Design an enzyme around this catalytic site. Structure first.
Site, short mmCIF file in Angstrom:
data_model
loop_
_atom_site.label_atom_id
_atom_site.label_comp_id
_atom_site.label_asym_id
_atom_site.label_seq_id
_atom_site.Cartn_x
_atom_site.Cartn_y
_atom_site.Cartn_z
N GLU A 143 23.56 -22.89 -22.53
CA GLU A 143 22.94 -21.88 -23.39
C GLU A 143 21.46 -21.67 -23.06
OE1 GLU A 143 22.68 -22.77 -27.63
OE2 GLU A 143 21.17 -21.20 -27.67
N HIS A 144 20.77 -22.71 -22.58
CA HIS A 144 19.38 -22.56 -22.15
C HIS A 144 19.24 -21.70 -20.91
CE1 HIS A 144 16.95 -25.15 -24.80
NE2 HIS A 144 18.07 -25.83 -24.96
#
Lengths: 51, 446, 106, 49, 57, 418
Positions: free
Chosen positions: B60-61
């Site tokens: 997700e980063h």
């Protein structure tokens, strides 16, 4: 008097009167062997409790 | 002027379609110049094992750091130059990416979303930069006492299962996740029958369906390299974690019993019951006059800073309980009054309490669906949970059949002679013994 | 509420005020009330000048009873000068208790 | 970090019907919490001495 | 013409009857949080920040 | 459909209603009150008035207000700025008539009993200490005191010496002189227009006109420094700009989005923010930077806001201020102006989506201008801003007299004359 008046006071006392024979009949069985109640030991034929 | 019943009929309905991939496409149209569109995925930390527990949070980063077609900061320049926003989150069960934009920018918005989830780069120089950002974010999470104490509650209620892990993972996994472990995570879990494309606002359903056919049709819509997860359930364990630290000024305590899953119909009368206990905070203006008994007692005696009740649901199990914050000489009294309110609902629950608790739940359901972003999140997460969107008229007919005897039956099933899970963070020397907590779950006179 | 006994029943009220003797100790009628929970909330709501007047009048009367003495007759509290300073604060405290009691049964 | 904290293993203390970590303990809990429990009930018929 | 919240920056407090007190609009403005070590401290009169105001129902 | 129905009453009251067919309703009363209207003898009266909405009124006791609103699941909230106060009520569609009656008792006939006001004084200390856990809150209250001599320098929270000493006679005097019908607007969202009107003819017996003129605000070029033990330095540097509702105010709104007014992408590097890129060239440590814009009815402030570490604070402020100097001497592309107009257009339409943001937007337009304008009109006023007006608004900042407020470890923070 409107001291304890209300439909709430006998609503919790409506659902407790099934378990309020835990108030009166428990006193009635709480005095079977604390007292030797003589004529209500023949409540059952089961208690020949003293010889 | 219509009634509340007539206004629930005139709510626009949700239209669902499907591709040959198996990807579902859902929409709600309502007459507006803005829209929210996003992708909801069945992925999370309960699908990870002990080797890759920080894998879904690491991905997700890197989702907005550049893809194959738009490398680096060229994705950020395109979103900003049209005035759009771009957000994401990750729970133990779900993962979402979504865009708020103008409703005439919908063809560009869907094209960026398809390029994020299919062709993300995950390059080696950006991975090494992202470890130190995540390691610093873990140290900031330790200063939030509410987030620590709910991580403790999951770790002791679900001890040897995948549901006890945290979303972020331990710090030793963060130091050692390679590029190979992230590419295996995407090709295993980012599959078309596990994804939902939702949209709310000024959208037509026919336009979103044709945009989904030219950007998403190359998704692998089969079960090649078969990774259909054999769903093991997770058991609840009555247990306790105590972390003693006297230098902290206030104490955090969370307690819960095992609750029902998502599709269990017991969920609706169990949150009529939690709405009778309620919530409190010491910035409230209503104290000592509030309808909730625990709120009125804590305001009169100044017993706590806050409390809240929760209903956390998973696919097969859940957590049903409460959380509070107080000083070091108030833990025993707050636990005494809270457990006495659970026992007063297992028996003795009155009809006028249930009428107030039903009115609270009707207001909380309508107030959530206000704006394109919470409506779009409700669409994308109800199709992963119930397989359909439950309309507001159906929620009202389930709420209307709850009465006082139903609340007494469902609370006795879930609370009474049950072992709770307890978590505490210091100064907690006056937190009662587990034998005294367990004996507070059964009552004396009834 | 009888108009024929308007003066006659005020003669029995003035007679009973002198037969009772809190006016011989320099007390007002609201000084002598029994302090239950509604009375103790009305004392807390008094303004600061009426509170301090009541505390001194009670202390002076307790000191007279210790010595078995009374005040000179020109210092007795008159019947048509007795101020019912506590009665507006007490009627409001009781009305609030009766509102919380109709709500608990309806 | 607080995510380095996990419960240590309790397998050599559990009752023999909750060693499986994958079954959700629906009916193996009410048919489990009775082992030391008429122990407590048949004690109090012996206190009738 | 418009609000003070449209041309963003001057702040506003709220009080509720059954909800928590909020301060401002853009006071926790971000990408001070993606740069490292922005910690919200432990409080002595501590509050709930999500404060039921975004609950699912 | 049924866009808005707008109506002036003969006593000066503004009524606006839009008929949704939504299951919920919303009523809001908006008043020209707040901290700019108090003087040096009653500082903090409007903070205590904000916290006193549950107290006993003439039509309902404090028990009946708490119990009667909670019995149907409704809410009651108060929100304040320096120039306005707003009382909001929300519930479901069939309960709205009995919560409209509670809202009129709070604002048009309050009692301020002695023992209830005295028990509420300790809530001022709790409410202020909660708000001041954010370092932005006290920096922005010091900035208004540094910038003005009066009438916008007053704080939103009560001063510390004054807690315990706000009297019931001061609360009665404030409502009598500032809660009047020519300063008020009533906005509905799920109610028809005839229902709000006969509601409105039940508060006109008193409060017939305008109550008290406030003093015009006078600019002071001051500076307030606050050394403490925080780990990061917060600083702000502003100049006087323009009042709300003018053609120059639109040029400062565009200039804010040219420079940078917050992030669009989660954990993004702010690629289109010219302020953020100029600071990050020479600084290789955690920071944040933004453009600040505050617009009021007779004045306004515009400037920069930095968050930095203690040893790097002078480098961050000097490089941020130099970037504004390049725009003021003509360095401005039309590509960057057009991208800034898109962020300003999209942010206005997104802030009016919900019922909460739409009701606040109609309420501010009714008090400031006394009319309603469609968002199609607002979008054409942003289009008419030229490139020469953006350069001219950056020249007013560079040559104007500055104000400053800072907090933290201030051993490397420059003074406003340096």
């Amino acid at each position: 008097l409107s001291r304890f008046l209300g439909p709430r006071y006998r609503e919790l006392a409506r659902n407790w009167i099934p378990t309020a024979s835990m108030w009166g009949a428990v006193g009635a069985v709480g005095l079977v062997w604390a007292t030797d109640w003589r004529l209500i030991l023949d409540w059952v034929p089961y208690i020949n409790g003293k010889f | 002027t219509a009634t509340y019943a007539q206004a629930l009929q005139s709510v626009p309905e949700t239209q669902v379609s499907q591709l040959d991939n198996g990807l579902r496409v859902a929409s709600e149209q309502s007459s507006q110049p803005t829209c929210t569109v996003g992708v909801w995925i069945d992925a999370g930390s309960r699908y990870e094992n002990e080797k890759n527990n920080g894998a879904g949070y690491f991905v997700e980063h890197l989702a907005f750091k550049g893809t194959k077609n738009r490398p680096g900061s060229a994705l950020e320049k395109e979103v900003e130059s049209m005035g759009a926003h771009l957000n994401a989150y990750s729970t133990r069960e779900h993962t979402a990416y979504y865009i708020k934009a103008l409703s005439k920018d919908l063809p560009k918005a869907v094209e960026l979303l398809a390029d994020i989830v299919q062709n993300c780069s995950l390059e080696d120089s950006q991975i090494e930069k992202e470890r130190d950002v995540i390691l610093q974010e873990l140290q900031e999470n330790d200063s939030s006492m509410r987030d620590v104490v709910f991580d403790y509650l999951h770790a002791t209620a679900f001890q040897g299962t995948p549901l006890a892990q945290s979303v972020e993972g331990p710090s030793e996994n963060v130091r050692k996740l390679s590029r190979a472990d992230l590419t295996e995570y995407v090709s295993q879990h980012y599959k078309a029958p596990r994804m939902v494309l939702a949209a709310a606002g000024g959208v037509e359903h026919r336009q979103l369906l044709d945009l989904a056919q030219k950007h998403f049709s190359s998704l692998s819509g089969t079960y090649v390299e078969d990774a259909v997860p054999a769903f093991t359930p997770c058991r609840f364990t009555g247990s306790e974690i105590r972390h003693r630290d006297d230098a902290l000024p206030l104490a955090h305590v969370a307690i819960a019993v095992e609750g029902p899953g998502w599709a269990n119909p017991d969920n609706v009368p169990l949150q009529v019951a939690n709405a009778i206990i309620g919530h409190y905070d010491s910035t409230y203006g209503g104290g000592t006059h509030m309808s909730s008994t625990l709120a009125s007692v804590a305001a009169t005696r100044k017993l706590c800073q806050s409390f809240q009740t929760f209903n956390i649901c998973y696919a097969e199990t859940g957590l049903l309980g409460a959380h509070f914050v107080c000083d070091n000489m108030s833990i025993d009294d707050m636990m005494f009054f809270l457990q006495g309110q659970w026992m007063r609902l297992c028996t003795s629950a009155t009809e006028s309490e249930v009428v107030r608790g039903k009115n609270i739940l009707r207001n909380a359901l309508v107030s959530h669906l206000d704006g394109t972003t919470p409506v779009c999140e409700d669409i994308g997460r109800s199709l992963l949970t119930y397989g359909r969107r439950i309309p507001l008229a159906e929620w009202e007919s389930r709420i209307a059949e709850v009465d006082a005897s139903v609340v007494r039956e469902v609370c006795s099933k879930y609370f009474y002679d049950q072992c709770p899970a307890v978590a505490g963070l210091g100064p907690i020397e006056q937190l009662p013994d587990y034998n005294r907590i367990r004996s507070g779950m059964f009552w004396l006179r009834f | 509420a009888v108009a024929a006994s308007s003066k006659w029943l005020e003669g029995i009220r003035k007679w009973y005020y002198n037969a009772a003797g809190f006016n011989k100790l320099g007390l007002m009628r609201d000084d002598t009330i029994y302090e239950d929970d509604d009375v103790k909330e009305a004392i807390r709501r008094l303004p600061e000048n009426l509170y301090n007047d009541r505390v001194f009048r009670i202390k002076r009367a307790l000191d007279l009873t210790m010595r078995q003495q009374i005040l000179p007759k020109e210092q007795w509290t008159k019947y048509e000068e007795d101020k019912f300073y506590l009665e507006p604060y007490l009627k409001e405290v009781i009305r609030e208790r009766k509102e919380r009691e109709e709500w608990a049964k309806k | 970090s607080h995510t380095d904290i996990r419960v240590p293993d309790f397998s050599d203390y559990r009752r023999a019907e909750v060693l499986d970590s994958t079954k959700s303990s629906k009916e193996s809990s009410d048919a489990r919490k009775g082992f030391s429990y008429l122990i407590t009930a048949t004690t109090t018929v012996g206190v009738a001495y | 013409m418009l609000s003070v919240a449209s041309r963003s920056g001057p702040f506003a407090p709220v009080l509720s009857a059954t909800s928590r007190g909020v301060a401002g609009a853009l006071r926790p403005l971000v990408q001070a949080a993606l740069p490292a070590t922005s910690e919200s401290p432990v409080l002595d009169a501590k509050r709930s920040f999500l404060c039921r105001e975004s609950l699912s129902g | 459909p049924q866009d808005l129905e707008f109506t002036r009453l003969p006593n000066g009251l503004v009524i606006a209603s839009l008929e949704n067919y939504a299951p919920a309703s919303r009523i809001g009363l908006f008043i020209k009150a707040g901290s700019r209207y108090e003087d040096s003898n009653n500082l903090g009266t409007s903070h205590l008035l904000r916290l006193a909405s549950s107290l006993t009124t003439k039509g309902a006791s404090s028990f009946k207000i708490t119990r009667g609103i909670e019995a149907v699941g409704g809410k009651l909230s108060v929100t304040s700025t320096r120039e306005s106060m707003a009382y909001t009520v929300e519930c479901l569609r069939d309960d709205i008539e009995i919560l409209m009656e509670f809202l009129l008792n709070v604002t048009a006939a309050p009692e301020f009993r002695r023992w209830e006001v005295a028990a509420l004084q300790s809530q001022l200390r709790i409410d202020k200490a909660v708000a001041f856990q954010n370092p932005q809150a006290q920096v922005l209250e010091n900035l208004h005191a540094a910038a003005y001599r009066n009438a916008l320098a007053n704080s939103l929270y009560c001063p510390d010496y004054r807690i315990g000493k706000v009297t019931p006679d001061q609360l009665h005097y404030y409502v009598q002189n500032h809660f009047t019908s020519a300063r008020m607007a009533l906005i509905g969202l799920g109610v028809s227009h005839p229902v709000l009107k006969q509601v409105a003819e039940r508060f006109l017996n008193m409060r017939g006109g305008l109550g008290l003129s406030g003093a015009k605000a006078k600019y002071r070029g001051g500076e307030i420094r606050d050394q403490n033990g925080d780990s990061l330095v917060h600083a702000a540097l502003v100049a006087e700009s323009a009042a709300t509702g003018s053609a120059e105010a639109n040029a400062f709104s565009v200039l804010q989005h040219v420079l940078g007014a917050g992030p669009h992408v989660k954990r993004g590097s702010n690629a289109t923010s010219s302020l953020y890129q100029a600071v990050a060239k020479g600084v290789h440590q955690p920071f944040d930077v933004s453009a600040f814009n505050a617009s009021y009815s007779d004045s306004g402030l515009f400037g920069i806001y930095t968050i930095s570490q203690a040893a790097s604070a002078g480098d961050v402020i000097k490089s941020a201020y130099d970037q504004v100097k390049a725009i003021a001497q003509g360095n401005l592309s039309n590509t960057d102006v057009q991208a800034a107009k898109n962020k300003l257009k999209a942010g206005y339409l997104m802030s009016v989506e919900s019922s909460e943001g739409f009701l606040d937007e109609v309420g501010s337009q009714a008090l400031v201008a006394g009319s309603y304008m469609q968002p199609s009109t607002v979008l054409q006023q942003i289009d008419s801003v030229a490139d020469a007006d953006v350069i001219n608004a950056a020249k007013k900042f560079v040559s104007g007299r500055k104000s400053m407020a800072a907090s933290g470890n201030l051993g490397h923070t420059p003074f406003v004359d340096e």
